């Protein structure tokens, strides 16, 4: 499987070629920033919650990232689901309507940005990524808007026009890019659940399952809905993600050091 | 069916495949000539792949390690070069190359504005390209289909450096038993293995399409076809997309 | 009045309220319809306003104690969601949305290549924008007069979910009393306390204006008045702004 | 005035309506960058001077960015005045007039930052601001260019086409947008006098006074023109502001540290 | 000569000497007019030069040490900001100013969508620009003449406020001995030393020139010059760049 | 030679002028980033090779940055010579050309980038430049494509459109610029030889000598072409330049260390 017979088959074959597709997959493997964690700040579960949610979020980030490298993402919440009612209710397709969350989570990863600025933070939009304030020990975190940049370009669903791949996906697929060690999801529930908690008084708790599982148990509690989990079990770097309740005081903080808090969903 | 409205019902959308760019001026020359009489038939986005040079920075990447997040954007710049080396020999006609944003918020002024605009094929997922293959699999035939089905074109047709779809590849080790297919489904495409001369992943964006019924792909290294395939004509193979009329 | 020269004279500006946008496609649609029957009577720049999102967004941001200069960019970004969709609806009529810099800069040439263009109202002070409020004072109907005055259009109309301005806000508290105002001045208007459909800060940009000598608040709900209002008829609220002709 | 209370105006009225402006008004107040300087670098008074100004204020910023953390703006000067004397004889308007100034003001700031950048200091123009810069000892300071984004949106003063809002008034609203804590406007002369002292050789020195005052007292000398003088009665932050001769050797790494060179304008 | 084709065959190039815009309204509302009349004749790239400003940025970057590099983009931005003023004043006439990118990668949709566009006629060489002389070598002629040569234009154009070049400068202390040419070449040019209305650089690119045979000089202070130099008219100084045709 | 005699001439004579241009070349000297090397990394002859030319010269970049400032630009190489001979069989002119080839450098760039991203080197690209990351001990490296900005303005050669313009002369144009101490380009061969050393098995090593002297021999080992030559022979800071192998281990991390490795071009 040398550099030699891969550029051959680079040069002579269709991409589609299932002997070429073979030979890159023997390629080296490197991770851009292995010593990161990306983390993502819910839209709907954390910011459109104001001061409450987070403030405390921002003090655990300042605090982490003292020990931690923090890719920090956002999602879009209740604004950008107003968007997606009025150009769904008028027939725009997917494409269209992913061009106008990005704007939500742009907005969104702003006001996070203008409360960590006076810590170093910055906000950053072109290479997520960042390399200089990644590597600074006073700075160390940035933070980017969650919504991936396929525009008018975005996969539709098998169904309606609500772009599938959203903040969760944007976010698990630059931890996936760059090959960081950790995807945290902060979210406002414990975890996963047997059911969704907020429209059953009974569901269980789940600290630890595969997307296998999920599907196989056919959960419908779409703290991480399916596009992101289908990505995750497709994924070379990444093979396990993270939710946690960013409402409980430290739980950010915990995950960070290695504690099981909330639930891990595998690959397999 | 519900489906969204088309955005830009009158347009169609040419692709034209990276490799029939790398065949230089003995391919160019005609191509162009073929498309400066179209100017006034039709309105047209002519979309670009990338060809040989992505081969290359595909095989330098991934000797340096490289996911396939970063070879996204690197074959993504070839088939830009491709489109300004193409904008270029129509300039004369007012045909510019315009960038991604402007191809998703502009595009219909700038065909207000002149007949036709060329554009990158590639879809900018860039760094969020998605994982499983070493090589990027949302590419320029994929990119193009995902416009045109979005914009609700009037067509899509794809220009190659071959007749169209075969039973395997006609430049390939099997080239003696490729048969040539004048019509098939992108389903049926799906669960064949084996090389094509377009994306995989543009079969799958096929099965989720809300408008673009066929897409046609044609060899414009012969003159006429790709005229004849902006009027329906049946001179390359026709993929189904699976797509049924409202 | 040895005023500057109008740069833009033949243009029509037309602001669209965000709450009219707001309301989805059964607003939408019929104004939508009404914009393609006025594209080949009217050279267009079509701005919207910020709506219902911006209430959210300031609810949030003022949450957190965001100055009043992280709010206005905030705003600004749903203004510009809302001619993104609106542009979109009229794609197919050769129109675009185009951004704060290209209003600035090639607003001529965009309405040279294509009947209309759409642009957000809203102005980029973003963080420059004044104190004093904890809301931002220079909004859509601000921004939009800013641009007309500047261009010397040949008007500015206000499109909005109500009929005109009233005596109180016809969907509020006093709704009872609230009396309707064929026609007011700016500067009656600006010494009067209480809630207005239009900014505060229009009124004191009219104050300063050099061209344009009255601005029409029309109900865009009703189909036909935004027609009329850009042939000068008297449908809804007529504000005059204290220019005077040469 | 709960969150609940504005949330609800926020919502049911007008922006206009004076009971939401009210609720809003008692909002907290969260300043992004508390601990910064915002200096403005006069353009006619200072860049446009050469070396021998601007070489001394160079050093200053380099040793003064040792203690205290700089935002620092350039003005436009000459060639400004030049484009508005052309653009107002052709009848060109204020919005037209505003970015041609913007033009001149970055000029001087990519002038003032090439002779910076060996100390680590760049010239920034997105967010002004700037997060990392101005969190590191090694920096701790950023140059970006005075004028107000306005551009053709400029509000025209109320006689003539001249932009009323200029690099003064684009480096106050800084400073006031970012909560920072002092703002230092840096011109050529010790401060503010009973007359202009450049045509008049009997003026007397103010070292303090209010915007109240200088209406009152019927000022004309205008070190700080009137449009930054409202903004600073309207200000949330920024309260009072230090002028100073910047030709004079040392007076802004004076002004930093707390030493009354110059002349204090107040709000109040 | 096998030559490289021409891009824009159809195109005019117009530079306008930035100490031509300095002179105000009493130049430019002319100028103004007579390229509005030209509007309708030919399909205009009008690009302004840098004047006075940018001789006070030099004395104050070259007081500060700074290289010529640095200097050039300061200068730039000087023949930017007198087309943005000239822009302004065709605004109703449909042209708008573009930026380097845009004339470098959109003209031919731009130049279709309206008659003319104004850009900057200095290069984007900027912290390149070549060592040397202290003063950027490669200004508003040079930039000019190598768009116009790269696009093989019919022609380039160069407004100046003076009647062509003369053996001296005739507003120089020679100004006694400064003697009318009707008609030079560049190489001849080059080889004097002395001061020319002209950058030097222009004679330098005239001699890798590909496809401008002849660059006329005028004075765009006597109505009428400018349009009889688009039609061919010799009303300054011709200069010969020594191309010679296929 | 005065400020005020200098500006006199500014003001009323031709840039043209002898005088004018003898008045500005008396100008003071400022160095924007003297203490900064430039090192030019091959297209063709390290890039375009991978992992094995390309990772030991990470490693030397990393390594080095701990003594030594360093602007890393990149070359194009082969996908840029395809390129120009498909634009060239078109017709098209060196303006054309040159923005394809900026593309090509552009990709170099970011794959070197990601290899250095996570040791905090970024990739650059309006002001090359970057203060912050050069002034950074963390840092104090930065990654740019080589490839000058002149796109369609391009000078063409004398004879053909390939551009003259290339990667070589744009990093040289970036030392010079900034007056940058020293000029490092990296390429594939131990420097310069009486004859190509790939085309003949007999070329004589040449340590040092003079761009007079390589025009007077008659050279054509273009391991550096006559427009970077020239350009040197021009040049007001960076007067020498040093061609290494980059495919020697520790050649790189030798010459910053003032090693005579490689061939010393002078001006003179
Ligand atoms: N089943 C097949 N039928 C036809 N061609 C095939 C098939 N399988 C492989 N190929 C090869 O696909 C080639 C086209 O190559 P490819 O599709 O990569 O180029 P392209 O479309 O021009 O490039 P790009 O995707 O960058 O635009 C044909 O020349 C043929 O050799
Ligand atoms: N005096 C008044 N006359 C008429 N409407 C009033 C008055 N005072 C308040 N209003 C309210 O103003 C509402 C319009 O709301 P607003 O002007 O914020 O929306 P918009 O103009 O669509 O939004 P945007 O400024 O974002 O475009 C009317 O529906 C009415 O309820
Ligand atoms: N030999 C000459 N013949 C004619 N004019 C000359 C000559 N030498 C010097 N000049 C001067 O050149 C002047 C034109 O100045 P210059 O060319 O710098 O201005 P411009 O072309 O308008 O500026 P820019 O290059 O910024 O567009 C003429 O007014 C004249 O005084
Ligand atoms: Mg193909
Ligand atoms: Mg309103
Ligand atoms: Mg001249
Ligand atoms: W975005
Ligand atoms: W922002
Ligand atoms: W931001
Ligand atoms: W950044
Ligand atoms: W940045
Ligand atoms: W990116
Ligand atoms: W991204
Ligand atoms: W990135
Ligand atoms: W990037
Ligand atoms: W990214
Ligand atoms: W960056
Ligand atoms: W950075
Ligand atoms: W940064
Ligand atoms: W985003
Ligand atoms: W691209
Ligand atoms: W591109
Ligand atoms: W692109
Ligand atoms: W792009
Ligand atoms: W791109
Ligand atoms: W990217
Ligand atoms: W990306
Ligand atoms: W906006
Ligand atoms: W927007
Ligand atoms: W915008
Ligand atoms: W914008
Ligand atoms: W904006
Ligand atoms: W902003
Ligand atoms: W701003
Ligand atoms: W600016
Ligand atoms: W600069
Ligand atoms: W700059
Ligand atoms: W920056
Ligand atoms: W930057
Ligand atoms: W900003
Ligand atoms: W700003
Ligand atoms: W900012
Ligand atoms: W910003
Ligand atoms: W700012
Ligand atoms: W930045
Ligand atoms: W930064
Ligand atoms: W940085
Ligand atoms: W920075
Ligand atoms: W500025
Ligand atoms: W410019
Ligand atoms: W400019
Ligand atoms: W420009
Ligand atoms: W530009
Ligand atoms: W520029
Ligand atoms: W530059
Ligand atoms: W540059
Ligand atoms: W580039
Ligand atoms: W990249
Ligand atoms: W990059
Ligand atoms: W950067
Ligand atoms: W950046
Ligand atoms: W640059
Ligand atoms: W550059
Ligand atoms: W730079
Ligand atoms: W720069
Ligand atoms: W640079
Ligand atoms: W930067
Ligand atoms: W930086
Ligand atoms: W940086
Ligand atoms: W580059």
């Not at chain 1, 209740?78 to 968007?83: V, Y």
């Not at chain 1, 939500?104 to 960042?130: E, R, T, Y």
């Not at chain 2, 489904?185 to 408008?211: I, Q, Y």
């Amino acid at each position: 499987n040398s550099t030699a017979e891969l550029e051959e088959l680079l040069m002579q074959r269709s991409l589609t070629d299932p002997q070429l597709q073979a030979a890159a997959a023997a390629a080296a493997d490197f991770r851009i920033l292995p010593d990161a964690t990306v983390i993502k700040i819910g839209g709907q579960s954390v910011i459109d919650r104001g001061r409450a949610a987070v403030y405390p979020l921002v003090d655990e980030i300042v605090a982490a990232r003292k020990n931690h490298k923090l890719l920090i993402g956002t999602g879009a919440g209740t604004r950008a689901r107003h968007l997606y009612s009025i150009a769904a209710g008028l027939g725009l397709p997917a494409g269209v309507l992913a061009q106008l969350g990005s704007s939500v989570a742009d907005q969104n990863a702003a006001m996070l940005g203008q409360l960590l600025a006076k810590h170093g933070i910055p906000v950053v939009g072109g290479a997520g990524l960042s390399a200089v304030p990644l590597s600074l020990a006073e700075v160390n975190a940035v933070v980017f808007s969650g919504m991936p940049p396929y525009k008018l370009w975005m996969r539709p669903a098998a169904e309606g026009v609500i772009p599938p791949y959203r903040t969760d996906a944007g976010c698990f697929l630059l931890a996936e890019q760059f090959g960081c060690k950790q995807m945290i999801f902060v979210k406002d529930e414990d975890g996963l659940y047997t059911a969704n908690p907020k429209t059953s008084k009974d569901a269980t708790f789940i600290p630890r399952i595969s997307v296998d599982e999920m599907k196989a148990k056919g959960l419908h509690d779409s703290i991480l809905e399916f596009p992101v989990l289908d990505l995750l079990q497709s994924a070379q770097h990444v093979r396990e993600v993270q939710v946690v309740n960013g409402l409980v005081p430290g739980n950010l903080t915990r995950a960070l050091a290695g504690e099981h808090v909330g639930t891990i969903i595998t690959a397999s | 069916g519900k489906r969204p409205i088309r955005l830009l019902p009158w347009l169609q959308v040419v692709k034209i495949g990276g490799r029939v760019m790398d065949r230089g001026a003995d391919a160019i020359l005609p191509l162009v000539e073929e498309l400066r009489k179209l100017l006034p038939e039709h309105r047209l986005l002519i979309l670009t792949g990338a060809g040989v040079r992505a081969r290359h920075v595909f095989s330098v990447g991934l000797d340096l390690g490289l996911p396939v997040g970063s070879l996204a954007p690197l074959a993504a710049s070839e088939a830009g070069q491709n489109g300004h080396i193409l904008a270029a020999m129509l300039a004369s006609e007012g045909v510019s190359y315009v960038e991604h944003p402007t191809v998703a918020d502009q595009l219909a002024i700038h065909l207000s504005a002149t007949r036709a605009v060329v554009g990158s094929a590639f879809p900018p997922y860039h760094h969020h390209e998605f994982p499983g293959s070493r090589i990027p699999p949302h590419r320029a035939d994929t990119g193009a289909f995902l416009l045109a089905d979005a914009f609700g074109a009037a067509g899509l047709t794809i220009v190659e450096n071959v007749d169209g779809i075969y039973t395997a590849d006609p430049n390939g080790p099997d080239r003696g038993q490729a048969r040539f297919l004048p019509e098939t489904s992108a389903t049926d495409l799906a669960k064949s293995e084996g090389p094509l001369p377009v994306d995989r992943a543009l079969l799958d964006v096929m099965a989720t399409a809300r408008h673009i019924e066929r897409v046609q792909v044609v060899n414009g290294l012969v003159p006429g076809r790709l005229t004849a395939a902006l009027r329906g004509e049946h001179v390359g193979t026709l993929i189904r997309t699976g797509v049924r009329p409202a």
